[PDB]
Amino acid sequence: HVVRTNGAPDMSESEFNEAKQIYFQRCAGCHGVLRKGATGKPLTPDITQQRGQQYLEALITYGTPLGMPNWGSSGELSKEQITLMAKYIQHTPPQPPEWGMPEMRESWKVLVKPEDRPKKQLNDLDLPNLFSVTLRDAGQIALVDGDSKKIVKVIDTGYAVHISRMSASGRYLLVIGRDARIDMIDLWAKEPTKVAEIKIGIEARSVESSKFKGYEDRYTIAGAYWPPQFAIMDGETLEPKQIVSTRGMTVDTQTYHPEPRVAAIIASHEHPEFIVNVKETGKVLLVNYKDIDNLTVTSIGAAPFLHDGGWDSSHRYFMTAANNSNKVAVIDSKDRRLSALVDVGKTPHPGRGANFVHPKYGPVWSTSHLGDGSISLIGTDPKNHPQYAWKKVAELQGQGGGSLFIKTHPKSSHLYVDTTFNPDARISQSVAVFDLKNLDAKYQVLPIAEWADLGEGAKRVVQPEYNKRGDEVWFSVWNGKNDSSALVVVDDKTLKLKAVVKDPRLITPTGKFNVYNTQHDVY
Amino acid sequence: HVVRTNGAPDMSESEFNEAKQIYFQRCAGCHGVLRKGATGKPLTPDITQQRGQQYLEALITYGTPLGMPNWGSSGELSKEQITLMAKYIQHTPPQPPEWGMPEMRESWKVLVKPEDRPKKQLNDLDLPNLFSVTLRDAGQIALVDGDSKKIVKVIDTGYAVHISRMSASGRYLLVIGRDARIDMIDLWAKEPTKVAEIKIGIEARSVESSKFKGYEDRYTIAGAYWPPQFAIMDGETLEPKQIVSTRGMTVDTQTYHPEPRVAAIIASHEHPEFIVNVKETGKVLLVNYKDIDNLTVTSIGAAPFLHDGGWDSSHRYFMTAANNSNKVAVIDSKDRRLSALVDVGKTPHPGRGANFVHPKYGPVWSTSHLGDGSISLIGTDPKNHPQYAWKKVAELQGQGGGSLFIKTHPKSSHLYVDTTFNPDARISQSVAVFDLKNLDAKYQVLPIAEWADLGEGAKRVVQPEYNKRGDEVWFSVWNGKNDSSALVVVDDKTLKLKAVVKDPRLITPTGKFNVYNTQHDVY
């Protein structure tokens, strides 16, 4: 047969199915399963037909400097395949494929069997103080030694590399990409080495390890945007064990939703459970892995379009926000119930938040507001500060909007606030630091990008991350003009510049994950 | 001879000079005379050699959707010329050319001699209520009828079309592009028609007409980034009459600066003079055109890196800011002196500002702050409010940072504030409106982008512009996803939606210039 779309170059039924398979294996992680866009732009026929075949071939062939791979000049895709892809994205988007146990098992690779792995750490690295750094546009992670401020390893994962997580033993580093590829890295090998890989879906954002006491390295979980599902895997091998669909009913209208994406997963410390946020249906699932054949799930209704979330300081209450809402949902992971919906007056910015002790209000959890740069504080201690629990107690004011990350550490007296997307260049190039011992005082500004010494041009600073001791804070810096990058390290006790990590291998550093602080949910 | 650069494909001395001529005629308006970038990205060899010949050819050939023309697929440039350009931008940037009276006169075209033009308005348009709208990526302006809300004419100018200005008679519309091309349009023709064109430099931003009483249509002035100069032309024909270099000594170090760009030009109402801001040397020039053969210029030292500025409500004091400064310079255009340097505590955002009467402080001029969305008010009435003159008297707070334009009108009780570059989508898609009769009250938010009804996707709203009566406010809206655009019209007395202008010819509408309000400096 012939596939035809108004205004599109007709294709063979075989050409279309070949392009379909390429699209969902290689493109959908960034462009979406219905091509509506995510990290990458929309590729629906209204837009692509306006660009035309030859423009589309050119873009796919050479890529762009802002994260679109050069599929042709890389050799990843053939001239003929690129022509097929340029034709394909001008046709109506088809139904995306499913991805079950057969597809997962076919993608599963064990490079080093558990019995062939070392019995102890064979390298001499200070593993808890390693930083795993995403090299966004290079499809790699870099392992950076926190003590010597040197790159010690670079590891290929794939385009669309996203985040790193740690197993509860501290031995295994887990990386997931937006195409739902997972890599498992053994930090005890003579040089840290990939030991297993698997693909759990077409599009994904989240991975996590089992962190309840006694379950170290037992299970790894991953959540997909498409298909709407999460998968529980063997923590030692990534062998897929259980797959659970998240298709289902919405919390607000109780009508069936055909694509409830998994937004985020964190690991419970109160029970052997994973906390799974399901976005469109607005459900927080507590998934119990004490028995994975007789699988227990508690579904807590929260609010539609759930985003990220994070633990409070006690690791009991899960603080989460939904888009289009001024409320923070508080899930009690111990009693397995919704505890509160906290009005913070403004829309909270998705993220783990930042926990610290307010001298007056006691333990608080904090969230930023993207538009105006304010930060809301919520009391999180029903035991000793019941008069403040699940209430907004205060508001701090940063330099302005555009913050992506706020960060503290239990051993630090400072709160760091970036302003990556602020439209003023001096503010996007700097970070605000609040004194937790005098929260009535204005923040101080650290000139992070200037310290990086990267030449003239637009520089953006992102994501404060502490070292294992809590006495250094690391920042990613990148000059959009010349492709140049650095990690800037501040002494948290003095607020002085301590080090600048520069290396040609440090390509578009974005997320930085300190091993200890990621393993132990320290924020 | 052979031109060679480390890492660049060698070129014929003739090929290089051919590419040089193309670069400075067609590319430098956006990419800069030393290729350091302006509207378009930097094209210095460090960056271009990393991209490589074939990527560079592809980009030049097909362009990009964010304002880089498709030189090859347009037919503007040959395959051979595009190869030469891709080689050329990998070589060391050469010295840019000069552009004097011979070059200006060679570019000068009179399409309709003044004696052949109509003696009165032959079309039936309400000319004072026309809006001249920049169609940024189309190289055109659209004339939109303020009464019927319909496009009535579309006029080609060139890529990099920038702003519109009006002659003091109300008859001639002046358009300048970033390549320093000027078009003069006769609004009295049966259909408004280009009557003259000229090129006054390689790179430019500003054009203005003579507005002192009695000099209607006598002179047009334009200022260039490169060469560092301004040119005075005959107001009826654009014939070049006088060219003045702005090369000279800096205000702060009194050392010679070889490229002092003309930042902005406005027209004096106190004297037959143009006010010319010279950026790097920090000089405000009062250029007197009573006698242009015996040319008098008063040079007022202000501050380095002068930007835009605007008149106060009385059209006597020129309010201007320099980058990297918390001060607003006040130039008295009547007495021809610096009046004050007003500390507003934060960096003012370049712009004309907004004038209104504060019930307590009297006439004030207002400026926004890009980072945090605040607005500073300065008293501008030494006669009746001397206790507030040249002092910051108050601060308003908008939705957040990212404002590009604030706007009022003497017949309006509202102040409008866009937030085009705010990182929160709801804020960038809306505008704040303050009640000038109750400035203690919080602003109201108008959902401008939602009213435009442009489908899902990132939409940005920019530049409130009033109609001639002051009772409508117009906004440009554009959906980045689908290329779709609208002008949204609000009833200023009710703050209700009044009209939505949609037309496939409305491609990337940016600046909107109401004829009457531009002619009479009404802001």
Ligand code: HEC
């Ligand atoms: C994330 C790592 C991506 C993957 C994998 C793919 N694409 Fe992509 N693409 C991505 C981005 C961030 C962008 C925008 C970059 C820009 O500079 O703004 C793009 C762009 C495209 C386009 C152009 C869209 C347009 O001009 O409107 C096309 C045609 C495109 N991408 C296609 C495409 C294909 C077919 C891919 C699989 C082979 C693919 N992309 C992968 C990000 C990412």
Ligand code: HEC
């Ligand atoms: C303004 C109207 C422009 C004119 C005239 C020219 N260019 Fe341009 N260019 C412009 C922009 C806004 C951009 C960036 C667009 C993007 O999508 O972000 C560009 C880009 C380029 C590039 C690519 C740079 C890179 O990938 O780093 C090149 C090689 C380039 N432009 C070359 C070029 C030439 C040779 C031109 C004259 C023939 C030219 N541009 C004109 C804006 C504008």
